[PDB]
């Protein structure tokens, strides 16, 4: 009845035309309304295979988010290699809305409903939908924010657990609230508050899950060994401002830990673009309180893989590849041609 196929999708959201928030604006121009009566048909006795690492859906979402960040977050001064490009840099209201990805006629989306599906292998519970769920195009690093939570277990997904260079997605079951704030009246100085209790607890649960994927070895957490600030720090956009949080505290086996954790954040104007090889400078931060309270719903890790001894294993945060962020939401979807 069907085969896997790569076709061009189309977006669908509930963006409001009167809204000034750029995500809403882009969506109203690029995407259609959501289905008011969405229907999902359970394929009984159907087992379907999935490979979340080869899903063209992700690639197409990537292209949308790039275009959206391009129309909505144009840099004042863009520096690609040696070229210097000056263009307007108006401050905008920037809060990501959910985007549904839908298939054209002749095609349909298969949705794996297995409770602890690692993204690759057979799905004993396949469903069929016309669109995916509402995915916020949240662009982050080290910490996946505002994503979908795992139902029942911490899930560990990697293209290749053996290849240390391959990123490790950590899908959490319980969110860890992170409250990041730039106080009103160094304008470039901010901080992210995290309840140390929850984080420590969650962090232990993920050690266990790592153990079961890595030979009950001892799990060690460390800050990133090096690289760009966007990678060595928890990077994310809040209200149009580019935050950089220092997550050194969050990633170390220290667990008086019941305390509140305050991460040193900085608002940057000069950044490295994730969209591609290029650097961008934006105007100084807006006035007044700048507060984003997000839910940490996943973690991006990277195993050292010394491959010298079985004494221990070490994990560090990373995740500059934003296709891994879309992958973490689109893992349960595939596009097939009827």
């Amino acid at each position, epitope marked *: 009845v069907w085969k896997d196929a790569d076709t061009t999708l189309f977006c669908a959201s509930d963006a409001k035309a009167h809204e000034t928030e750029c995500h809403n604006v882009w969506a109203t121009h690029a995407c259609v309304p959501t289905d008011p009566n969405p229907q999902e048909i359970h394929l009984e006795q159907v087992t379907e*295979n999935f*490979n979340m690492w080869k899903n063209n859906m992700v690639e197409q979402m990537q292209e949308d988010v790039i275009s959206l960040w391009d129309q909505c977050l144009q840099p004042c001064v863009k520096l690609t290699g040696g070229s210097v490009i000056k263009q307007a840099c108006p401050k905008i209201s920037f809060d990501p809305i959910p985007i549904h990805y839908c298939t054209p006629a002749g095609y349909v989306i298969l949705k794996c409903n297995d409770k602890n599906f690692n993204g*690759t292998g*057979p799905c004993k519970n396949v469903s069929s939908v016309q669109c995916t769920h509402g995915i916020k195009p949240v662009v982050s690093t080290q910490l996946l924010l505002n994503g979908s939570l795992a139902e029942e277990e911490i899930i560990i997904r990697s293209e290749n657990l053996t290849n240390n260079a391959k990123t490790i997605i950590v899908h959490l079951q319980k969110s860890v609230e992170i409250n990041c704030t730039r106080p009103s009246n160094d304008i470039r100085k901010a901080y992210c508050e995290i309840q140390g209790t929850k984080w420590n607890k969650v962090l232990k649960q993920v050690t266990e899950k790592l153990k079961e994927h890595f030979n009950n070895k001892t799990i060690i957490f460390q800050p990133p060994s090096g690289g760009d600030l966007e990678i060595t720090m928890h990077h994310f956009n809040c209200r149009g401002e580019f935050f950089y949080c220092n997550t050194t505290q969050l990633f170390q086996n220290t667990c008086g830990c019941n305390g509140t954790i305050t991460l040193p954040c900085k608002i940057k104007q000069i950044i490295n673009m994730w969209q591609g090889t290029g650097q961008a400078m934006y105007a100084p931060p807006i006035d007044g309180k700048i507060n984003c309270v997000s839910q940490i719903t996943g973690i991006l890790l990277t195993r050292d893989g010394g491959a010298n001894n079985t004494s221990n294993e070490t994990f560090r945060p990373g995740g500059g590849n934003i296709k891994d962020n879309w992958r973490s939401e689109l893992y349960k979807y595939k596009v097939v041609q009827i």
Partner: antibody
Amino acid sequence: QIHLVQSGTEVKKPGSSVTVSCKAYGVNTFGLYAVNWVRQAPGQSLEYIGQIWRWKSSASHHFRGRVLISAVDLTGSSPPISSLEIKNLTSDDTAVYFCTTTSTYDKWSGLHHDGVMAFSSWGQGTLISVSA
Amino acid sequence: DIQMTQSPSTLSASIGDTVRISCRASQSITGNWVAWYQQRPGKAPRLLIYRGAALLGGVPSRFSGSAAGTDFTLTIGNLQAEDFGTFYCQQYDTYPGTFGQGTKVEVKR
């Protein structure tokens, strides 16, 4: 690409038990790749021993209870591993044993038929000599 | 339990010739679930054709398949050095997979 690397030659005596292993390098998961064990006696043709598919073990009725086929998925330290164990070894088990693997992802590929398939990727083979 | 019997046991062929190697099952295989392998001496067997006629990726187009009920046959055009060896037919219509006797394609002289 895929390269199935099998264990070394085994020279065992009658009645004993032997376990061989297949390291399926380049394989993403045995959830998409079925593993089939096939042996070939010296001067003879190939005979299918058994398999593991969707993490469900099986063997030809010719080897019921004498054969044990198991497999573990990809880990941080090693590729996917399959293993064949054989008890009550005889001189008629002096064949060269092959670990073979085949992708079962494309359900409508000609390769496989509901657990029964052709054998795409072949290992190096491992010789087992059973003699007193 | 299906039995595959091949014909002939061995055939002598020259370079460039077209080799026909047939194989027959104890019962009818509707799904055409048959494969053809080649085996070099001392080396593992290579898969050449699957599902009766479907030619595997990387394998020369000189290899052809033919599938009809109980009778299947491998056709090799423009034969060449690497082609000489032992060819096997296999059925995967029903459990368990069964091989043919094999066919030794050897240089005529």
